[PDB]
Design a protein around this ligand. Sequence first.
Ligand SMILES: CCCCCCCCCCCCCCCCCC(=O)OC[C@H](COP(=O)([O-])OC[C@H](O)COP(=O)([O-])OC[C@H](COC(=O)CCCCCCCCCCCCCCCCC)OC(=O)CCCCCCCCCCCCCCCCC)OC(=O)CCCCCCCCCCCCCCCCC
Ligand SMILES: CCCCCCCCCCCCCCCCCC(=O)OC[C@H](COP(=O)([O-])OCC[N+](C)(C)C)OC(=O)CCCCCCCCCCCCCCCCC
Ligand SMILES: CCCCCCCCCCCCCCCCCC(=O)OC[C@H](COP(=O)([O-])OCC[N+](C)(C)C)OC(=O)CCCCCCCCCCCCCCCCC
Ligand SMILES: CCCCCCCCCCCCCCCCCC(=O)OC[C@H](COP(=O)(O)OCCN)OC(=O)CCCCCCCCCCCCCCCCC
Ligand SMILES: Nc1ncnc2c1ncn2[C@@H]1O[C@H](COP(=O)(O)O)[C@@H](O)[C@H]1O
Lengths: 100, 19, 347, 49, 50, 320, 459, 120
Amino acid sequence: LRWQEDPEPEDENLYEKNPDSHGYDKDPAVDVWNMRVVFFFGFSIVLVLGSTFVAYLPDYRMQEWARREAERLVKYREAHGLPLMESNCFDPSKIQLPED
Amino acid sequence: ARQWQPDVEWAEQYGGAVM
Amino acid sequence: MNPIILIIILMTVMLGTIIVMISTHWLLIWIGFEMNMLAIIPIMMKKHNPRATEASTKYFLTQSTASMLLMMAIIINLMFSGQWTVMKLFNPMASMLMTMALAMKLGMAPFHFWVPEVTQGIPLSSGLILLTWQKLAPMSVLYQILPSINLDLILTLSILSITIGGWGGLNQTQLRKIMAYSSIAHMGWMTAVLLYNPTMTLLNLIIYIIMTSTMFTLFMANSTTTTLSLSHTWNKAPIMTILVLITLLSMGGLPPLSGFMPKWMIIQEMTKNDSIILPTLMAITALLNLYFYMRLTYSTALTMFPSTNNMKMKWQFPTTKRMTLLPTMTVLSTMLLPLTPILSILE
Amino acid sequence: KFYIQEPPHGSPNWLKVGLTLGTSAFLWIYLIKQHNEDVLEYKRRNGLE
Amino acid sequence: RDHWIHVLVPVGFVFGYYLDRKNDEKLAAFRNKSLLYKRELKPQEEVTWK
Amino acid sequence: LQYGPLAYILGEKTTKKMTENSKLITVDGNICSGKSKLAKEVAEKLGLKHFPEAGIHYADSTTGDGKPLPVRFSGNCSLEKFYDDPKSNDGNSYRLQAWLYASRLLQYADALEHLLSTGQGVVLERSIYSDFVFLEAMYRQGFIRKQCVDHYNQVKKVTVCEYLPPHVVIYVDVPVSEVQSRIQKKGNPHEMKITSAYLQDIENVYKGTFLPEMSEKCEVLQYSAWEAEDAEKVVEDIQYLKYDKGPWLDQDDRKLHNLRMLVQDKLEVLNYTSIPVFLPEVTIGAHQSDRVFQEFTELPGRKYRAGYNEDVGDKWIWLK
Amino acid sequence: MLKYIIPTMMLMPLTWLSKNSMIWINTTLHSLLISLTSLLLLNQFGDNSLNFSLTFFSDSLSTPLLILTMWLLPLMLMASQHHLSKENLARKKLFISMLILLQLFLIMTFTATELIFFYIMFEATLVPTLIIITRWGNQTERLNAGLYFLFYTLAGSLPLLVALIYIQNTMGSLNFLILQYWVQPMPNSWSNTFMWLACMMAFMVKMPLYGLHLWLPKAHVEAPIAGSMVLAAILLKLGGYGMMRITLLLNPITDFMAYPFIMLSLWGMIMTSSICLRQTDLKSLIAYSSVSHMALVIVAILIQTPWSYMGATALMIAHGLTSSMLFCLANSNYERVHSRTMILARGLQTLLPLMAAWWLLASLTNLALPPSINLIGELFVVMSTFSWSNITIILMGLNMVITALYSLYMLITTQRGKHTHHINNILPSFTRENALMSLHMLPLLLLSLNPKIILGPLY
Amino acid sequence: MMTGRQARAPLQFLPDEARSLPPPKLTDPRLAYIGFLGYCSGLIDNAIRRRPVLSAGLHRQFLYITSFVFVGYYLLKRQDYMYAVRDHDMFSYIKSHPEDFPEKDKKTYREVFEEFHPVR
Ligand SMILES: CCCCCCCCCCCCCCCCCC(=O)OC[C@H](COP(=O)([O-])OC[C@H](O)COP(=O)([O-])OC[C@H](COC(=O)CCCCCCCCCCCCCCCCC)OC(=O)CCCCCCCCCCCCCCCCC)OC(=O)CCCCCCCCCCCCCCCCC
Ligand SMILES: CCCCCCCCCCCCCCCCCC(=O)OC[C@H](COP(=O)([O-])OCC[N+](C)(C)C)OC(=O)CCCCCCCCCCCCCCCCC
Ligand SMILES: CCCCCCCCCCCCCCCCCC(=O)OC[C@H](COP(=O)([O-])OCC[N+](C)(C)C)OC(=O)CCCCCCCCCCCCCCCCC
Ligand SMILES: CCCCCCCCCCCCCCCCCC(=O)OC[C@H](COP(=O)(O)OCCN)OC(=O)CCCCCCCCCCCCCCCCC
Ligand SMILES: Nc1ncnc2c1ncn2[C@@H]1O[C@H](COP(=O)(O)O)[C@@H](O)[C@H]1O
């Protein structure tokens, strides 16, 4: 024969001894307060106020400014006859080239 | 259905003179 | 053994190593090694069985041969330099012979062939002395002769020690041979960074002594000398499984632990000197050491091997063993990496 | 009593507790004294007074 | 306190927040010295940010 | 601790307290030799300390509250189930025998600790040198396997070599029929199932194997059932021995210091009882081992070290 | 970042000083408080990263990975508390300690200003993961799986250590903010070739790359549920994070070094997805799906166009949420049948209708149903790789067929058909399990409303 | 490397010129970490001997914290000293050898030509 081993413990059903079980714990008061903690600090706190916080981020990575600033610059250079964008990112008067 | 723990057959491989 | 005689013999071991450390004359270096061997022989024969006597015979033969090659190197130094200062060596033949002699004293490959034997034959405390305290005096002489150490010789000894101490412990089920092949690999790690920066040599020596002392102190606390006896620890002392877990994960060089600290710093001083192949091969070879450390942690901490019935009796007796500095060494061998720039105290 | 044999650590070794607390308090007062001496020596050498 | 364990993690935030502010004054070498945001100091004001 | 190398340096020698009355005397005999009183009678005539025979709960009696624990924590075996079913499936036979060997090893360590710390001799009942006489008596009856005998011989080979023999062995000649008559007059409903061949093999390993090998290393005293009734004759025989054999002659302060350092460390004494030889009668799997260990930790006065358990009324722990 | 590291470390006394029945509720509550606190990292600018100190900063790449990481801990605590209910209280606290410590290493892995500190935390994440897999895994093969997980990562990353120390010696610093401005172009040589490989192959293993992915259908399968959640949802994405950091230093050599590996991914997502069509183990099917989805992130980082980085970080966040939910669904059926065979339990919509709806939503987000951020990342990577080469759309498009094929087969095998007769322990769905599914899926569907926060530093 | 520097005055843990340097504060984060190591040593010492880990031996845990803070304070002082000596030797050597450390012409990017590599 083989060694002295405990047999396989059977799968417990939480709904037998606690038919109102939320599945967090076998003690029903601990189980229901775990449910309240998960749902309040999971949904009432992080999801709701998180969506409110992400919804009202103060110009996330300054894109809105960048529209408004562009709405300034176009308005400067439509009237002053300038082209809307130069193909040179920097002034060619301040670039030296390798002579050849 | 429980966690596997090593049997005598696993343990005897570590009990020789060499590995 | 008489405890007074034990105290005098351990003080004579420490005295011989200190005489190697503090002396400026070569004859006093040789005298320190002779005193150290002559005093450590009864520590190996403490339990009086033929394995201890065989181990002491093998240790005597290797250390006597190394002491004779050391004195020959000293005599050739007096030939070609006319003086006796413990400093650089004034002949490459004397440099080669002294590097061979110190490699034989350390057990660096291919002179490693006595370290897994003798450590198997002797008790765990004497093996602790052999693998921690007996590495101090030859590394001190290698610290002081490094302007004359040939580079290819010390690097050949280093990589050969790292590879052979890596492939040694993969076949081992006896814990003392595991610590012996770990010793060979770590001495290769110490001497590889020697000619580049000996402060990192000293850092590797101190961290290795801390980790080895932690592992031997855990082995003496649990009274286990094999892997399969170390596997009974969780049913007796569950905290000791956590301690051997974190210490063996430290000894493999896994961050964020302190045993990652030396080898990383060794690489940090070898890529400065434009050696890129050599610390890469050394780091990849250290994975073998980490593999058999992981084997020991699987057998001890991360699984539960079956114990026997008589273990239920040992539940009723707490450990009356003097586990000296085991919390201190266990903390220092694991949680010291955030204090990595402390190494400047060794400069 | 509870135990059949009186344990060695059943009562505190008051000599060892006294040596422990005295050694620790001595190390703290010597540490604070050494730190005050070091900051005073630093300010005296570099002139911050 | 009957519920002293629910102030380990919030105070560990607050203290941690404090250390972040405590580090900002250690990185304040270019305060009002950047070429973009340098300006004359407003009355009854000693630093531009804290 | 209390005793260590420092006390041996500071003058606590053990040959100073070693007197002529300091004799470790083992009384041996069959299952109803009546020796259980005889040993006690020797202890009340030579002034020695009597240790009763080691059972399942000897270690329970020496540790904690001194009361017997439940059998799943100590033993995991039963003498009565061995008497009912000696050839059982689960392997109670060698598991009981190995537990009794470990309990007698603990008893013999306690005996040498008392003898070497106090200078008082100890009268033992069926020491570790007479435990195999049940083992072979099981194996000759087919109750255990050859592998169980090999496990016993390995554990005995690495444990009994660290000790000394007793000074005096007291053996009691009782034949098998008188043993059976005393069992039937005892009234134990499980002990009456003990066969004749088992008691005969006990007596055969007594007279053929135990007493000849103990005739060298110590001085055996053998008595019948009726001449062991008169205690004073046995006491006069012990008092007029000329102790000239065994390794008790070459025991100085250093060797007995090493022996006292051995026998006061019980985990060092009990180190090699649980050697990793995976024999199915003694091997316990990890889930049962973990379950019984965590239940043993929940017992009062057993969770921490002894002077540190608040629930049984330990004080000053914050200064310990 | 020290307003997050200190509460994560104060989670250790919060789990070791708690009452024996309160050690799940307290850790769930305070980890959800830390996850609500994580939203302060959304102070991102269009030009400058949110630069805290010499040690920590957080751009718009690390910020969503941090928010996902700090969100994943309460979900792992809810997932792993049922099957560890019969566990010893000390090992239960040790499991919670390993999860907290892994979160602690991850949050300062993604905020490492300096790359060798990134390496120390990046390889520090191995040890709690290794201990969780090889200690609380269910089957025999957790030990071998932990070996493969450890030794692929270390064999890839110990050349990364030498490469990073070489950059520290050559450039002078391994600060990422310094190396934005002191980066030199890496010329063509064999030395710079193995420089590239040593900087890249560690992250190739962690993504995983096809051919090097052999640790993952063992490490993700043999792990417990919290281990599988953190391995799929975060620990694969360390590789994408590290590649997006380290390909700054590997130009213009990447422009001709990426050619084999792109092939290994463009073929690998065809192979592993096809492997998902024949997987009998449902958890292995989810594992090979994770390989198939991270192949696109490897391709997008190696072609290094802006649309590819936006799509790759959106795919990383989206796959973290989706794969974590799929592993949790597979656990929700493993806790009822005690097997991982997919053909065993069938017809589960007849018995568990709302849980079948959670399976439906997780399968639709797995197959990149628009307008999910799964599809936003998938689509943007496909746009950038059409710009890379016009033929890749075939390997993309056929993948988007096969990705549908196993995503619904998983829905049809488990949830639809005739229910298995002999299996009668199919309990009704707990409130905990549906809470776990909803806390995975509702942030994933809310991120479709405002996806610009998960599109990286070059939105 | 610096073995000739600390050879005119051997076996000095902290020399006299080390006192020219500011000592670490008692609220040093490194010193707080070493005090944390002392607390961990106390907890491991109670765990290995089967004591109540937080309760038993508050005097012993306090001596662990005190001893590690005490040793680590001097270790941090010597650490800061040796890094200051490293920088002092570096700066004295650069000042004494100007020919080995020339002042580089820092050119702005209008003259500096870098090869452009398009990613497409
Ligand atoms: C910031 C404020 C935001 C406010 C608005 C929120 C917008 C929606 C957010 C996400 C909503 C998900 C929740 C519902 C589904 C999950 C639960 C479930 O199945 O419950 C069934 C249950 C009703 O069914 P039952 O009979 O009781 O049980 C189910 C049966 O067992 C049998 O079940 P069954 O299979 O018969 O029934 C399931 C059925 C099955 O139907 C399907 O699976 C078909 C859906 C796919 C094809 C059709 C849609 C294709 C795309 C077009 C729509 C998007 C673009 C439209 C815009 C214009 C064009 C661009 O699905 C539905 O009925 C859901 C309709 C809406 C579907 C939305 C798309 C999800 C598809 C997957 C991802 C697609 C890409 C991402 C889209 C993101 C959209 C925001 O519903 C509830 O109990 C609802 C509870 C409350 C839900 C609150 C949701 C938001 C929570 C967020 C908290 C924090 C923010 C505060 C806002 C709170 C607002 C109240
Ligand atoms: C983030 C990375 C990690 C991932 C895991 C995160 C875990 C932590 C979770 C924390 C909480 C969630 C954080 C993300 C929140 C994202 C949501 C959010 O803030 O959105 C902002 C967006 C902002 O939209 P916006 O871009 O227009 O912003 C406007 C800006 N302000 C408000 C300042 C002017 O909010 C909305 O869109 C709200 C609109 C009203 C409500 C929604 C109406 C439409 C929704 C569908 C209705 C039905 C349509 C038809 C369907 C028919 C059936 C199919
Ligand atoms: C997970 C398994 C697969 C892992 C793959 C890991 C990456 C594969 C390639 C790694 C090569 C080794 C590290 C290279 C670091 C380069 C740093 C550097 O500065 O390079 C330039 C340096 C150049 O030297 P230098 O930079 O000093 O030179 C000055 C500059 N010039 C050239 C102008 C003079 O390269 C080298 O010195 C050597 C590079 C190649 C090293 C070959 C030895 C290792 C062989 C491959 C091992 C791969 C892993 C083995 C384990 C597999 C699993 C068991
Ligand atoms: C640049 C570097 C210069 C040098 C720096 C300093 C180097 C320090 C080297 C440390 C070497 C330690 C060698 C071993 C300790 C010496 C004393 C000894 O022999 O202790 C063992 C002793 C034997 O007891 P025994 O009766 O034989 O036990 C058998 C079982 N019945 O007792 C026991 O067995 C008791 C069990 C516990 C013993 C633990 C001993 C730990 C000693 C090492 C501490 C760590 C090292 C110091 C700190 C780091 C410094 C680098
Ligand atoms: N193998 C064994 N068979 C029977 N009895 C045993 C065995 N081993 C030990 N004993 C003990 O020997 C006792 C018999 O001696 P007595 O004390 O005279 O009854 C029994 O009560 C048992 O406790």
